[PDB]
Amino acid sequence: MGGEIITLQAGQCGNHVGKFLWSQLAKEHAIGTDGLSQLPDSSTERDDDTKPFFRENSRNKFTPRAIMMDSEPSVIADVENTFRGFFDPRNTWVASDGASAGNSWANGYDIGTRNQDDILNKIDKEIDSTDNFEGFQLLHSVAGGTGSGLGSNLLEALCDRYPKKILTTYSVFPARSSEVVVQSYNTILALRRLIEDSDATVVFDNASLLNISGKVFRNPNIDLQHTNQLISTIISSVTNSIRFPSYMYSSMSSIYSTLIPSPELHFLSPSFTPFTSDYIHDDIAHKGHSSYDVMLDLLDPSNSLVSTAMNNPTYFNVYNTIIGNVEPRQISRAMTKLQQRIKFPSWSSSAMHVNIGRRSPYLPLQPNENEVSGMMLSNMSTVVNVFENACNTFDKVFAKGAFLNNYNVGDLFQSMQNVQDEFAESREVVQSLMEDYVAAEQDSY
Amino acid sequence: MGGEIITLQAGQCGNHVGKFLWSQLAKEHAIGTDGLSQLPDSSTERDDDTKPFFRENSRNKFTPRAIMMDSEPSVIADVENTFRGFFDPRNTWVASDGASAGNSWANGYDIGTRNQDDILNKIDKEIDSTDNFEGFQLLHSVAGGTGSGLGSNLLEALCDRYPKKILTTYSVFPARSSEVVVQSYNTILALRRLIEDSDATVVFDNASLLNISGKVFRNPNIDLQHTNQLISTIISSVTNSIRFPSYMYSSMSSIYSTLIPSPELHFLSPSFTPFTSDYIHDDIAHKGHSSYDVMLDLLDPSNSLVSTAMNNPTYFNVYNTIIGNVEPRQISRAMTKLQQRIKFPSWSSSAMHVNIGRRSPYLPLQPNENEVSGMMLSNMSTVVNVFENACNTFDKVFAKGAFLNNYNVGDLFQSMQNVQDEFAESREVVQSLMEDYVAAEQDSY
Amino acid sequence: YDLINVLKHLQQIFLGYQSGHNVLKFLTKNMGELTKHYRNDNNANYDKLLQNFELERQSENPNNLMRQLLMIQFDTETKSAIYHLKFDINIPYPLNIIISRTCMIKYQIILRYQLVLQYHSRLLDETWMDLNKTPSWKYRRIVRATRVLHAKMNHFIKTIMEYFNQNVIDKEVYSLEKCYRNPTLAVAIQNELEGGLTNIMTNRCLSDLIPLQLQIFDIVYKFCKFIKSMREDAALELIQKLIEYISNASSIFRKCLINFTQELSTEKFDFYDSSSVD
Amino acid sequence: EFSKKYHVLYQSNSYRGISTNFFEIINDQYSEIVNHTNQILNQKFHYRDVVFALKNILLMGKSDFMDALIEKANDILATPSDSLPNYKLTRVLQEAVQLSSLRHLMNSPRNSSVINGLDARVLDLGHGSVGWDVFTLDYILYPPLSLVLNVNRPFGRKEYLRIFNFLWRFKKNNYFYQKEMLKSNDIIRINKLSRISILRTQFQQFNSKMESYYLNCIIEENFKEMTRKLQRTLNIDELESVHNTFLTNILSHKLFATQPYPTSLVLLLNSVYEFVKVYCNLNSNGLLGKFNTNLKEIVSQYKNFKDRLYIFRADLKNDGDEELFLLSKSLR
């Protein structure tokens, strides 16, 4: 649409999912991988996916509005592959000090500060060239140093500078069996900033994300790269109804407002099936519309961890279903109405039934193998368990006095042990608030 | 009508009878072995089916609405076959230790209790997909570990959960020329559930049954698949009047009233003639209506142990004949009318003139000799014998102590054997009441 | 001429199918002016602004018949300002061989009902954005009410909007392009336009969304003024009124969603009495 | 037109028509129109389908269809029928054909509008105290059958209406029976027990067999032959003529056989209401005392009904017994 989204990529993972994301969108509208201008519909506008994510520079070829930030490995990989046409030389940034973050929030955080002016010059250009910017989306992982420390640092500036512009994040939270030991520290220290400084956070629990990628989409040797393929399908899909003409009266802000009731209740959970939609993995599936819809309510399939079974005592505050299908409008509509009524996601008095549905058809030049598929976004008050786990795991590593080493070189963790403690108290307050939303006592009469 | 029935397949036995059932349905409703929709073929004027038992995928693959529960061997056998399309992996819920071909009720009960949620999730999806739910059918054996124990756990949860929906079972009772004495433990524990939690038990007593598989089909060696093919032919025939329009034996309410004559006596015995119906190994099966029907009254061709007619009760509470033709309808029609008026059973005060007919067309699209068939479902006082032989068997095994070890592991036996006693007292009251129907003392006003 | 491409554009902009963002930009800029009943200056500011959004996005279609010929009409001063906004299309050539007075009036009513819902949404978004920034402070009972009220309000408007877009505009445009493609017949054009107008007619009789929404917008704008400033008894008084207003609104809204799918007028009849005066 | 044009020029050379030449020219024209008349009806119009389809819906020739309809309709019909009921009833009538699999796909009638051509009417037959009596179905004819019969001078349309009520009235009592009994059969609501259960079930069974044979054995079988001739070879005008003759027979039949059976049936329907009312109340002492009174009265009424039912059954088997014929005279 004419509402622009500017994309921020931070860390190894953020640049990886980002490059792959752009390859996907390019494939779907029948254009090049450098971004060549060769839309079959530029004469009636059935393509509008070449403007909430891409910009024109009059070099006769569209380039994505994206800024890539990290250390050296990811930016070298992007340039090496033909997805280098999506990035102008200014969009590639290499800036490391103390020789990368090293999987430390405190180092990562510190690197952003020195070259603070350099980042801002990039942000200011991108906003000023835009016709009318709605706000930002951050792609990053909270598992590294760089993804965490720099991603948090950029969030704190954005909230402060612009308080009237929405910051949505796609945060990948690490594994809960842990793949790297020091992740738990990064997660706490980043998660405090994420909570206060972000208007919306979409939680992607990596543990879950990885298992699905290995089991469902096969391929010997899963790595980061397989798992990011799943994430790029997710990122494309969440925007689907706005970027296609089906709706255009929806906007980023009104979708954000309805899903997110408060800035300490802004945690979104995904669910997805088949777990691709717009294929770029492998496997085709076809399963009925009734069956497809039922599976969406369910919390066993889903790309984040939360307590199993639909209907929870820590209720669904609000539910948004983004339906993608090329079948008639009537079935989708009849099913969103039914879904709210049947009470598959729990609903309470003194909060009303809040279930909305968005409907889209997929591009005619995206591979024809389509089926009834969807993504679910809901704000559900059971999210808390991921955050708690990482805190418990964090204190145990700390107690031993192992793995404290990496942080200590950076000033922030050396002085200010306050932050970890702060977050634990902060999490208890949040929990208290989520609970009042069920009852009439959510504001005093 | 088109209203859905959800089919529950439990243990080795259920999965084996079920696969044959869908195969046999498929030939009949003119659709392929994977359930693919054939366009010039009719399945929606010749039948209601392709919506009661089947559901449609987005790639237009009909699949039966069935939930498979058991262990690994049987789920693995079906996919290796071409009958794979009738099953789906999401429909498959698989244990790994509730296994045993033989009697081990406890082992099964206990596993169900551990994985109550995983199953209840399967069940909830299938209910959510229903448009107008008629009720449930359980296919199982009460001679398995897996079919027996688990199937009866699920009946108690379904009783509680829904009281006004029909629960029908086709239950194989354990043979009494068997080589195991644990048969008693399974029969008693299950039989409590089968009277109260279910509204109908169509008793297949394996001693009689196994001989029907042995003599008619002429198998060279006996296996689970073999006997289970014999059961699939009888089961398909019983549903014929439901599946065809222009018969008011299709509505849910009207089947229940005719079939079930007391909420306490609802033990059914089958007879069928000829038994072969798409698995002919015999020189001939082509015969006039009269032979088949006259033979349907006879207790000599029966799949359950209703014994012979001398030294046994002759008192039929209800008799239902289900009719198949592919030879002049008028000869058969006239004959059914005469058969009700003649009164083959004895009759007293309690009831009289209880002979009912349902009329259906038989389809030659199955491999046949252009034969005419019919099935008898009857409620007969002779059925008490079966329970009686169980009572005798239970006492001898009590005394011996044989292989209590698996049982105590189960919930029911660590919670004393008081439940079993309580059941015994109730059960005898049920047999005495069934005996009374014989005489003129049940109705006395 | 390239008629068919122009035909596509007519459904897109005029019918209210996907002009979307530009309509949004128009609302945001206009928003202060639209709160007020009417004023003399308003019509001129709107014409300039209306024209201004079309220019700014530039070209994107070979034919910009839609962008230019489309005009904003005023009932008076050529209920509140939003009700008085109206569209006139001057019409292109060669294409007005069944066009009659009625059709423009009809495309205009479908625009008007969608347009009030979208405007309420823009204002609602604006109200949230203010409360985050520093002069609000008091993160007190006022803050907690703004959060609660926001969630409910946004969902109900969005559901009304979802149905309005879906059952009407999007449903009708799919059918018009199909009837046009298959033959070459002139009659087919006239038949498809007629059909589309009769479906409009049932929507015109059915709808009377605008009186309830106008009353909610005025209260919200008072709430908006209060929240942005530093904060007393008065803040509490308003806070309590807002929840009473909302409860009453929630029940009405819930009944209203059922009617777009059903096409029944009895439930709706209850809705008319609600909307006028709570 | 060219072959008939040639023929008239041939005929003109003859001074006076000769029978043999006139016949050969007719036998040719006759084959050409006839061949064309079969396609027009059969392919495009889908005439064989629509006639069968018409029997199932209008004349209740499908039992399954009637079961789904009574089941949806039940709530709406339980209360008086007014403005809003008519609309609601036409939707349930329309939805029912799709559910019963007679408009579900295109193999079935969906290519024709004959079966969306049917609308439910509510008039003011029998009691206006319930919606049940007042329901009727009305079928509005489509070209070329509309030359035959129409809403203006509607003698055939009147006949069909009479028959429809008679069938439907048996079906109405039948519906009530099935649901009433069904509730009691379901769990959670000794010798007192089970005795109440068989008697109630026995009677519902009895009504279902009778209903089955009239729909199946008479209407469906006679109708099938009417379609079969039409597809095989004929015109629309021959079908209506044959139809009228069918209807009249059914009317005759109604009056002679169904007067002892509806007298027994209305009474039985009172007894089932009496039994449920009592039944619902049961789980102290009071509930037991009511139960003993209900059980004695209920058997007695049932036994009387059954005795009457047996004589009517004996007549049904005979296709004419003198005694039933007398009883029907006494009542009228």
Coordinates of C-alpha atoms in Angstrom, one line a residue, chain C residues 18-265:
Chain C
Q18 CA -9.0 -0.1 -3.0
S19 CA -8.3 3.7 -3.2
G20 CA -7.5 3.0 0.5
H21 CA -4.3 5.0 1.6
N22 CA -5.3 8.1 -0.3
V23 CA -8.6 8.1 1.4
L24 CA -6.7 7.7 4.7
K25 CA -4.4 10.6 4.0
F26 CA -7.5 12.8 3.2
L27 CA -9.1 11.9 6.5
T28 CA -5.9 12.6 8.6
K29 CA -5.4 16.0 7.1
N30 CA -9.1 16.9 7.3
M31 CA -9.6 15.5 10.8
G32 CA -9.8 18.8 12.9
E33 CA -12.2 20.4 10.3
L34 CA -14.5 17.4 10.1
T35 CA -15.0 17.4 14.0
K36 CA -16.8 20.8 13.6
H37 CA -20.4 21.0 12.2
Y38 CA -19.5 23.3 9.4
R39 CA -17.6 26.4 8.6
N40 CA -17.3 28.6 5.6
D41 CA -13.7 28.0 5.0
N42 CA -14.1 24.1 5.2
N43 CA -15.3 23.4 1.5
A44 CA -12.4 25.2 0.0
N45 CA -9.8 23.6 2.2
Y46 CA -11.3 20.2 1.4
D47 CA -11.3 20.8 -2.4
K48 CA -7.6 21.9 -2.3
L49 CA -6.7 19.0 -0.1
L50 CA -8.7 16.5 -2.2
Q51 CA -6.9 17.6 -5.3
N52 CA -3.6 17.6 -3.4
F53 CA -3.5 13.9 -2.6
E54 CA -4.2 12.9 -6.1
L55 CA -1.3 15.0 -7.4
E56 CA 1.2 13.9 -4.9
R57 CA 1.3 10.1 -5.5
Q58 CA 1.6 11.1 -9.2
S59 CA 0.9 8.8 -12.1
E60 CA 0.6 5.1 -11.7
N61 CA -2.3 4.3 -14.2
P62 CA -2.0 5.3 -18.0
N63 CA -5.3 7.1 -17.6
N64 CA -5.8 9.5 -14.6
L65 CA -9.6 10.1 -15.6
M66 CA -10.4 9.0 -12.2
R67 CA -7.9 11.4 -10.3
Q68 CA -9.0 14.6 -12.2
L69 CA -12.8 14.2 -13.0
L70 CA -13.5 13.1 -9.5
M71 CA -14.8 15.9 -7.5
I72 CA -16.1 16.5 -4.1
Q73 CA -19.6 17.7 -3.9
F74 CA -21.3 19.5 -0.9
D75 CA -25.0 19.3 0.1
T76 CA -24.9 22.5 1.9
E77 CA -22.2 25.3 1.7
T78 CA -21.0 24.4 -1.8
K79 CA -25.9 16.4 10.8
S80 CA -22.1 17.0 11.0
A81 CA -19.4 17.7 8.3
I82 CA -18.8 14.0 7.5
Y83 CA -22.5 13.4 6.5
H84 CA -22.4 16.5 4.1
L85 CA -19.3 15.2 2.0
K86 CA -20.5 13.8 -1.3
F87 CA -18.9 12.7 -4.7
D88 CA -19.6 13.9 -8.2
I89 CA -17.7 12.2 -11.2
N90 CA -17.8 14.3 -14.3
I91 CA -17.6 10.9 -16.3
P92 CA -15.1 10.0 -19.2
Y93 CA -15.8 9.7 -23.0
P94 CA -16.7 7.3 -24.7
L95 CA -18.4 5.7 -21.7
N96 CA -21.8 7.1 -20.4
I97 CA -24.2 5.2 -22.8
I98 CA -26.4 3.9 -20.0
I99 CA -25.2 6.4 -17.4
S100 CA -28.1 8.1 -15.7
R101 CA -28.5 10.3 -12.8
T102 CA -29.2 7.6 -10.3
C103 CA -25.9 5.6 -10.6
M104 CA -23.6 8.4 -9.3
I105 CA -25.9 8.9 -6.4
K106 CA -25.8 5.2 -5.6
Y107 CA -21.8 4.8 -5.9
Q108 CA -21.8 7.9 -3.5
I109 CA -23.9 6.3 -0.7
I110 CA -21.6 3.2 -0.6
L111 CA -18.6 5.7 -0.3
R112 CA -20.3 7.6 2.4
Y113 CA -21.0 4.7 4.8
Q114 CA -17.4 3.3 4.4
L115 CA -16.0 6.7 4.7
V116 CA -17.4 7.5 8.2
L117 CA -16.0 4.2 9.6
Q118 CA -12.5 4.8 8.2
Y119 CA -12.5 8.4 9.7
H120 CA -13.4 7.1 13.2
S121 CA -10.5 4.7 13.0
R122 CA -7.9 7.4 12.0
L123 CA -9.0 9.6 15.0
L124 CA -8.9 6.6 17.4
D125 CA -5.3 5.9 16.3
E126 CA -4.3 9.5 16.8
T127 CA -5.7 9.5 20.4
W128 CA -3.4 6.5 21.4
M129 CA -0.4 8.1 19.9
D130 CA -0.8 11.2 22.1
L131 CA -1.0 9.4 25.4
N132 CA 2.6 7.8 25.1
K133 CA 4.4 11.1 24.8
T134 CA 5.7 13.2 27.9
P135 CA 2.9 15.8 28.7
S136 CA 0.4 13.0 29.5
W137 CA 2.7 11.5 32.2
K138 CA 0.8 9.8 35.2
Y139 CA 1.5 6.2 34.4
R140 CA -3.2 6.9 37.5
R141 CA -6.7 5.9 36.5
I142 CA -6.7 8.1 33.3
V143 CA -4.0 6.0 31.6
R144 CA -5.7 2.6 32.3
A145 CA -9.1 3.8 30.8
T146 CA -7.4 5.0 27.7
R147 CA -6.0 1.5 27.2
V148 CA -9.3 -0.3 27.9
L149 CA -11.5 1.9 25.8
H150 CA -9.0 1.7 22.9
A151 CA -9.2 -2.0 22.6
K152 CA -12.9 -2.3 22.5
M153 CA -13.4 0.6 20.1
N154 CA -11.0 -0.5 17.5
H155 CA -12.2 -4.0 17.2
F156 CA -15.9 -3.1 16.8
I157 CA -15.2 -0.5 14.1
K158 CA -12.9 -2.9 12.4
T159 CA -15.5 -5.7 12.3
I160 CA -18.2 -3.2 10.8
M161 CA -15.5 -2.2 8.2
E162 CA -14.6 -5.8 7.5
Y163 CA -18.2 -6.7 6.5
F164 CA -18.9 -3.5 4.8
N165 CA -15.8 -4.0 2.4
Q166 CA -16.4 -7.7 2.1
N167 CA -20.2 -8.3 1.6
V168 CA -20.6 -5.3 -0.6
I169 CA -17.8 -3.6 -2.5
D170 CA -15.4 -6.6 -3.0
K171 CA -18.3 -9.0 -3.7
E172 CA -19.9 -6.8 -6.4
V173 CA -16.6 -5.8 -8.2
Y174 CA -15.7 -9.6 -8.7
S175 CA -19.1 -10.1 -10.4
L176 CA -18.9 -6.9 -12.7
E177 CA -15.5 -7.9 -14.2
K178 CA -16.8 -11.4 -14.9
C179 CA -20.0 -10.2 -16.6
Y180 CA -18.0 -7.8 -18.8
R181 CA -15.2 -10.4 -19.9
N182 CA -17.2 -13.4 -21.4
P183 CA -19.3 -11.8 -24.2
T184 CA -18.9 -8.6 -26.2
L185 CA -22.5 -7.5 -25.7
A186 CA -23.5 -3.8 -24.9
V187 CA -26.6 -5.2 -23.0
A188 CA -24.3 -7.1 -20.6
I189 CA -22.8 -3.7 -19.5
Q190 CA -26.2 -2.2 -18.7
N191 CA -27.4 -5.4 -16.9
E192 CA -24.3 -5.6 -14.6
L193 CA -24.6 -1.9 -13.7
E194 CA -28.4 -2.4 -12.8
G195 CA -27.6 -5.3 -10.7
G196 CA -24.9 -3.6 -8.8
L197 CA -27.4 -0.6 -8.1
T198 CA -30.2 -2.9 -6.8
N199 CA -27.7 -4.5 -4.4
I200 CA -26.7 -0.8 -3.4
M201 CA -30.4 -0.1 -2.8
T202 CA -30.8 -2.8 -0.2
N203 CA -27.5 -1.5 1.5
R204 CA -28.9 2.2 1.5
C205 CA -32.2 1.2 3.0
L206 CA -30.4 -1.1 5.6
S207 CA -27.6 1.3 6.8
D208 CA -27.9 4.2 9.3
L209 CA -24.6 3.7 10.9
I210 CA -23.6 7.5 10.9
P211 CA -25.7 8.9 13.7
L212 CA -24.2 6.6 16.5
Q213 CA -20.7 7.0 15.3
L214 CA -21.0 10.8 15.2
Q215 CA -21.9 10.9 18.9
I216 CA -19.0 8.6 19.9
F217 CA -16.4 10.8 17.9
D218 CA -17.4 14.0 19.8
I219 CA -16.9 12.4 23.2
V220 CA -13.5 10.9 22.1
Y221 CA -12.2 14.3 20.9
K222 CA -13.0 15.7 24.4
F223 CA -11.2 12.7 26.0
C224 CA -8.2 13.3 23.5
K225 CA -7.9 17.0 24.6
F226 CA -7.9 15.9 28.3
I227 CA -5.4 13.1 28.0
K228 CA -2.7 15.0 26.2
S229 CA -2.5 17.7 28.9
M230 CA -1.1 17.3 32.4
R231 CA -3.8 16.1 34.9
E232 CA -8.3 16.4 39.8
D233 CA -12.0 15.5 40.0
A234 CA -12.7 16.4 36.4
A235 CA -10.5 13.8 34.8
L236 CA -12.3 11.2 36.9
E237 CA -15.8 12.4 36.0
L238 CA -15.1 12.0 32.2
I239 CA -13.4 8.7 32.8
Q240 CA -16.5 7.3 34.4
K241 CA -18.8 8.7 31.6
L242 CA -16.6 7.0 29.0
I243 CA -17.0 3.5 30.4
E244 CA -20.9 4.0 30.6
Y245 CA -20.9 5.2 27.0
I246 CA -18.8 2.3 25.8
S247 CA -20.9 -0.4 27.5
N248 CA -24.0 0.7 25.9
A249 CA -22.1 1.0 22.6
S250 CA -20.7 -2.6 22.9
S251 CA -24.0 -4.3 23.0
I252 CA -25.4 -2.3 20.0
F253 CA -22.2 -3.1 17.9
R254 CA -22.5 -6.8 18.7
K255 CA -26.1 -6.9 17.4
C256 CA -25.1 -4.9 14.3
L257 CA -22.4 -7.4 13.0
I258 CA -25.1 -10.1 12.5
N259 CA -27.2 -7.9 10.1
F260 CA -24.6 -7.4 7.3
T261 CA -24.4 -11.2 6.8
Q262 CA -28.2 -11.8 7.3
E263 CA -29.9 -9.0 5.2
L264 CA -32.8 -8.8 7.8
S265 CA -34.2 -5.4 8.9

